[PDB]
Amino acid sequence: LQYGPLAFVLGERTTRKLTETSKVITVDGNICSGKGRLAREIAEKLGLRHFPEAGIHYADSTTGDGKPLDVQLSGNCSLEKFYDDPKSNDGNSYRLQSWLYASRLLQYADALEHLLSTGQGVVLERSIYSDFVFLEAMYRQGFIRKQCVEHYNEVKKVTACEYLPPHVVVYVDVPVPEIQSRIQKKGNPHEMKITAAYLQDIENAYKKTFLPEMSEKCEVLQYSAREAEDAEKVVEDIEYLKCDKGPWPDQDDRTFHRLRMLVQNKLEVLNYTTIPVYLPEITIGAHQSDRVFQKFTELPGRKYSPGYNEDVGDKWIWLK
Amino acid sequence: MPLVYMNIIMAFAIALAGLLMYRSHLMSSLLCLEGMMLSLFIMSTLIILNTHFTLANMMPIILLVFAACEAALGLSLLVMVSNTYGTDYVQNLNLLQC
Amino acid sequence: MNPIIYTTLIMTVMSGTMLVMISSHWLLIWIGFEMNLLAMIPVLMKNFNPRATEAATKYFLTQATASMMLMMAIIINLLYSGQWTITKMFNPVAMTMMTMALAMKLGLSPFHFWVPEVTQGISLQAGLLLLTWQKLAPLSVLCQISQSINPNLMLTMAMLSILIGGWGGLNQTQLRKIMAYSSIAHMGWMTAVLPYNTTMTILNLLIYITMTLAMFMLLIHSSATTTLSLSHTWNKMPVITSLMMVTLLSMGGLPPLSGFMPKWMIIQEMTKNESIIMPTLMAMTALLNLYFYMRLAYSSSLTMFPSTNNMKMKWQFEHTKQMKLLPTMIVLSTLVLPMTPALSSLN
Amino acid sequence: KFYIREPPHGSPDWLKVGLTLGTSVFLWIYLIKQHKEDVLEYKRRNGLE
Amino acid sequence: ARQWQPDVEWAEQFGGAVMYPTKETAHWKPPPWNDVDPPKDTLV
Amino acid sequence: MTMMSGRPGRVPLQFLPNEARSLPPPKLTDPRLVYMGFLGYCSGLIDNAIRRRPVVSAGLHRQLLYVTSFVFFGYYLLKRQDYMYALRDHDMFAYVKSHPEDFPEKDKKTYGEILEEFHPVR
Amino acid sequence: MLKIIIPTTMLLPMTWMSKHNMIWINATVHSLLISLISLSLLNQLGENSLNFSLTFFSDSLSAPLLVLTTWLLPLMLMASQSHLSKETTTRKKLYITMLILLQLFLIMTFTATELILFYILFEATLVPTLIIITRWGNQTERLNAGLYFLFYTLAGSLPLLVALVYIQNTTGSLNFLIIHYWSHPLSNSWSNIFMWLACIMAFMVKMPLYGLHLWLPKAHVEAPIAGSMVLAAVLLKLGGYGMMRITTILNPLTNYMAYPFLMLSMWGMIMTSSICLRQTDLKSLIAYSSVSHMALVIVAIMIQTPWSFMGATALMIAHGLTSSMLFCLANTNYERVHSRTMILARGLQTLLPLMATWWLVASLTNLALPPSINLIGELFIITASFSWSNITIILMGMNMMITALYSLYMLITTQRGKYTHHINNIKPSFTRENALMALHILPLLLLTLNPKMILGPL
Amino acid sequence: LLDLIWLETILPKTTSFIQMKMSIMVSNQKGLIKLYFLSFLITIMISMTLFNYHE
Amino acid sequence: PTIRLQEDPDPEDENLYEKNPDSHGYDKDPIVDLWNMRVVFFFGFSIVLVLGSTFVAYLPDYRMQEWARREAERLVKYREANGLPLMESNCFDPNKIQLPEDED
């Protein structure tokens, strides 16, 4: 049965499934730092579900088949051309930033739904609470306008206030010259054009806004580059945290019921991402919108509801 | 009608006029509502006693009960209003227009 | 709010309305009104925020004043005739006070100001309840005491309600305020025919309730409270906007849609008495409601407004909660005119 | 093909389908029977046959 | 070559708190996207 | 005004008095019943369209239930409506029969004895 | 007459069940078959009407109108499929559905036996027309046009409704046969005057009457081609049909209530003909032409003579065909050059000779060259007006001079002179467009061969 | 002078102007309960004198 | 960006003669185009036009023109034979009409 008021009335309660290891974990860090490996190790050791960082096609992997769609029908933005031409007059930069924030919101909703449904913990790379640093690094470099920042702040204000911040925030600190050396050793021709000022802006945003404001909600575990490979020590540092200061201890059955109703129904999660604020970077004309929607509806498993597409092998349609 | 009936009706009219004309405090208007309830209680009791309507004697008590409910309701709302603004002024209830 | 507590409060609202509808004693009718209001106040405050609190406070003040006037009218009627049964209302001053109290409860002009504010301050579900279920009890009482009504006062209030509903709706970009002004105009239409035929009042109430339920359910399905947010729905689900356009046309009263049936019937009834000027005025005034419905239809269905990029993500997900009665409500809102004679079953 | 369960599977919900079909059939049979008895009672009361 | 459709300038006519703005109501603001006004610092 | 609420002998919430059993029931091929079934079919199609299912083929059991429910309600609705109109006619004829002074049958005049003004068109 | 109504209702699901690339073929074929079936209604009697049932009847006035409606549907389909090629399948089916619903409403309107059923259908025709105009029009003005189309109509028709129900409370019936047989004169009182105005103004605004005509240029210019065809050819004739039906209960009040409308019709006929002489948009010229011809029809209905009624019927049929043909002719050039300015594309006879022949024949029928049925209707109305008053021949005469002028002006501007040098995208005429022009024009001359079929019940 | 100006001016433009002005007059209220509760008092007194005193 | 919105450019119009030199202007699909032409020509000209004109031309005389002419011929013959006037100013017999008693 679908979770709802009826399930809550008889039986189902979230508070009982929490078994001292729920602990939503996020592992933040600068570009090219090894935060993903640390998050994978934390998830493996503690037995929590690992969520890889949400990209342009995160929503594609959770709907239909998990395969990504064409960039025209999903995202409509490019990271590679953001690196190539960050000051392009077609609005690619803020479009990419807004789409990435929406993807992060969807991933956070998925992780919260899983945790509240099963009681198992989750480990995320970045979150909606951390995305803004990139936006700041975009604004200080002149890549986006101030109106874009205002729109981003409005959307974040109406979206991020409805969820619970993570239990423990893990940060990996890597100096900018080391990051440049790692990027050069990587070999991707699009990341070599990242100027050091952009990385320094990301680091400044992190260390001056995110960590100070996150430390008030819960204690923050910072690790340098050398003491992050030893994942067992990080895990046993996590295991001895006194987590009784944030909003998580101030949660009972009814608040959990409201949150669980919110985390499912992804349309209600994404409601305020498409607010009618007409920025040229993200506003799409009627003709292009109609053409792109017609193109999307013609994908092999997208015309009808999931179980009603006989062109991908759905049977017994006329009894469903 | 005797003079007493006219006096009670005048009291009800005065309380209604006091409710309809707000100054600043919501509490004063709630007091005017309570006064209207009291006037109705007195008027109904006098009518029921005059005509010796025995079973109607329980009617005014019922009135009082719902008066209390109405009184409680108002007070509850006032609390919330105060918690929003630090005051109970009706000027602050202007977020919604016609 | 706990779902159990919410169910109990909804049941108490409905029980108060039913007590009003089944009572023979004026005290029990007043008690039904009190219980309905007491249970209705928290339902308006379900999603807590300052706007909801303001709407609840305004609603409480209006309804409490109306109930005080109601009780005073009852007591005056008892004084001049020792009667508790709801009947021909032996006193004219008491009848005037009763009419004013019931009009204030219904939101008829000139006691109309609270309706747009309360509707705008609450959620769409609370607005649905307020504009559909809350009309039943006062209209039932008015139908029961119709023979003693003063036609001048009620006709004046009905004409004022139609005029004010049209003029106020002309100025709105918020969908809830549009619905509230539409409700004011439709209440005016309902009360215009009440002194002549209560069956026509019941028919108009039923058709209005069906159309309003379809409207509110379509607005909940596409999470839009403003014109600009409703102008995006075509790029997510065009079927919803097309059904909305047809429903708006029906609410405008155009033949051969169902919304034409009540006005037609009411006009005919008014010409069975003499009453020629008033129906003509009422129809010419309802043209204003048709105008702003048509403007909404222009914004949402007949033209395509620009959209946003993030809308692409919304393409990948489906509506989770489904309204089981929405299709039947739409069909009853649109294609019911050929079954007009079935109104005989209402009397 | 779907990445998720899609709770409505390839086979339809047999309980719901059976309940719906049974309700429709029962309503049709009830309507036929009621119409037959109504015709009989009208004929008896007015004495046509 | 193609049918006219509303653009941003057309759509901005319906984005205000009211149609037919006047001098008095030109300062009315539209309600917040969610119906939550920012909390005042009415310290007691 | 309420014409029929206080009609003597009326049972409060019956919906179908026993006297109505003396009227011929509507035929099962009544065009009004066919239109009610059409309304049910339209409701089923709209249900399919809103749920993003193939409109004509998605649920045949659901569409069948829609049509059946609409027809089932329409039959009794038509019965009650016909009963109400029969009651109105019965009361009207009885009242005309019991008040002959208010309904006189005056003498008939032929058109050869009635003087009608002629208005030429020119 | 369900043998015509049911096949259109069957056109509906046939369109919605058709294969994506066969909608036009199926719709056109079955529309033509329905027109062929409706051709049998022309067998009329000399004494009474064909009373099919309690609900529908056919007269010698409504049968040619029904034939015109059923014949216009396939022409509209042929004219629409060019500019709707880029449209999606569902929206094309919705457009065809709008056209079919309009035909059904018109067919039921022209044959309803009761006046309230007639009113309901005659208002129901509003919705598909408004949807077509505001959804498939090309420019931003269409929205305004739609509003002008709607309220102008409703402000006329809402009083009529009241009057109708009032009449049913007085006489007990709105059946047209009962109304005709039990007719009683209207006395001279203020109440009767306002009843007359309520019964007349809706049809007046439908014609439209001069002074109440401002909605028509907007609606007929901003509409797509099929919308303009059905607005000019059939929807304007609703007013004339309704007036000829309703005038049976308005005597002898009409004898003096017609004076303001007669003066408006004659002077405004002169005025709209004059307006046609200085017009930069080719579609607006055709719209104002329609206004002038309808003013003639209004005069004919108002003077209330058998000759005027015959002339009015003939003129309505002839104008429907001619104005629809002219709108299609203008649409061909618009689709070629994407502009409605008349002087933009000139010398088109050099580039498109057969289309120039079609233009010449259409403009010849517009100026009522004898023995076309346009001329027959115009001459009957002029003779009746001369009997009404010998001075009318002045105004009518002036109209006959102006019409031809602007008509030929239009031709001379578009076909003659030298071609515009920079316009190099004028392709040869398609078979579809030539067939459309022929299917417009041949019935006109065929009807000339047998004019008693469009002369009405008188 | 006639078709584009005065015929527009009399019927449709005047109607639009009047309806717009009345809409502005009716809908522009501050949302203060004080003002329209005073309005309620005025309405009650008028309804008690104009309609109720005459029976 | 010095732009206002992201929009597709207005496309050029397609010439049906480019891909189909004999295109009939009905459809871009040549076969569907040809059959649309054929059905329009057959059901518009061959069926409705010519056969409908023939059907209308031979419609039976339900207007009773020939019957009226023959009746008038008989009436004229009889009246001229017996010397009666061809037509009477009264179409109704006065013996079946009762005028008002007094005109003063």
Ligand SMILES: CCCCCCCCCCCCCCCCCC(=O)OC[C@H](COP(=O)([O-])OCC(O)COP(=O)([O-])OC[C@@H](COC(=O)CCCCCCCCCCCCCCCCC)OC(=O)CCCCCCCCCCCCCCCCC)OC(=O)CCCCCCCCCCCCCCCCC
């Ligand atoms: C009066 C006489 C009788 C008339 C009755 C009244 C009219 C008919 C009944 C009305 C209700 C019936 C249909 C209701 C459900 C339709 C909803 C829908 O979306 O349709 C899509 C659906 C196609 O969807 P699909 O097949 O799944 O794949 C395509 C995708 O879905 C692609 O879908 P998409 O969503 O991606 O496409 C988007 C599209 C989707 O938007 C729509 O499709 C619009 C549909 C709105 C439904 C109507 C509203 C509610 C009804 C009120 C109607 C009022 C009528 C009165 C006049 C006023 C006019 C408003 O939106 C747009 O493109 C925007 C266009 C803007 C134009 C706005 C105009 C809309 C209002 C016009 C309504 C006209 C009446 C209905 C027209 C036909 C509709 C199918 O259409 C159909 O195929 C169903 C219709 C045909 C089934 C019936 C056939 C019966 C069986 C055949 C045999 C016949 C038996 C005869 C017996 C004899 C034995 C031989």
Ligand SMILES: CCCCCCCCCCCCCCCCC[C@@H](O)O[C@H](CO[C@H](O)CCCCCCCCCCCCCCC)COP(=O)(O)OCC[N+](C)(C)C
């Ligand atoms: C917009 C379309 C309108 C539809 C409205 C909802 C339709 C579905 C609701 C189904 C109704 C359920 C009722 C059946 C159970 C029996 C109840 C019965 O006992 O009630 C009777 C009452 O019968 C009901 O009134 C009949 C309900 C039927 C309403 C349909 C008429 C709608 C007008 C015509 C439009 C076409 C409708 C098409 C239907 C799909 C008792 O009469 P009474 O207690 O003495 O009346 C009290 C009030 N009085 C005295 C003041 C009059």
Ligand SMILES: CCCCCCCCCCCCCCCCC[C@@H](O)O[C@H](CO[C@H](O)CCCCCCCCCCCCCCC)COP(=O)(O)OCC[N+](C)(C)C
């Ligand atoms: C833009 C185009 C719109 C459409 C045009 C519609 C045309 C409508 C015009 C109405 C035609 C006549 C209406 C009434 C007939 C006579 C009117 C009156 O002027 O005649 C005299 C009336 O006398 C005086 O004039 C009294 C009327 C004066 C008051 C009327 C106001 C007219 C002023 C102009 C206002 C513009 C109206 C149109 C607004 C758009 C006749 O004397 P009398 O025999 O005693 O009256 C006959 C009726 N009786 C027998 C019952 C008594």
Ligand SMILES: CCCCCCCCCCCCCCCCC[C@@H](O)O[C@H](CO[C@H](O)CCCCCCCCCCCCCCC)COP(=O)(O)OCC[N+](C)(C)C
């Ligand atoms: C491209 C080249 C063009 C030029 C070359 C042409 C070659 C020669 C062909 C031209 C022929 C000349 C025409 C001369 C007339 C001869 C035919 C005429 O005599 O027949 C008429 C008959 O004509 C028909 O009656 C008129 C046709 C009917 C028109 C209906 C059109 C079909 C419907 C199409 C859609 C409707 C749209 C309009 C809605 C109103 C006479 O009728 P009537 O005097 O009695 O007959 C008496 C004897 N009867 C009764 C026993 C038969």
Ligand SMILES: Nc1ncnc2c1ncn2[C@@H]1O[C@H](COP(=O)(O)OP(=O)(O)O)[C@@H](O)[C@H]1O
């Ligand atoms: N919010 C964002 N804005 C712009 N770029 C982002 C954003 N999030 C991630 N990226 C890009 O993703 C790339 C790699 O992501 P990152 O997690 O830092 O490295 P790794 O894959 O080794 O964990 C980088 O080029 C980074 O710029």
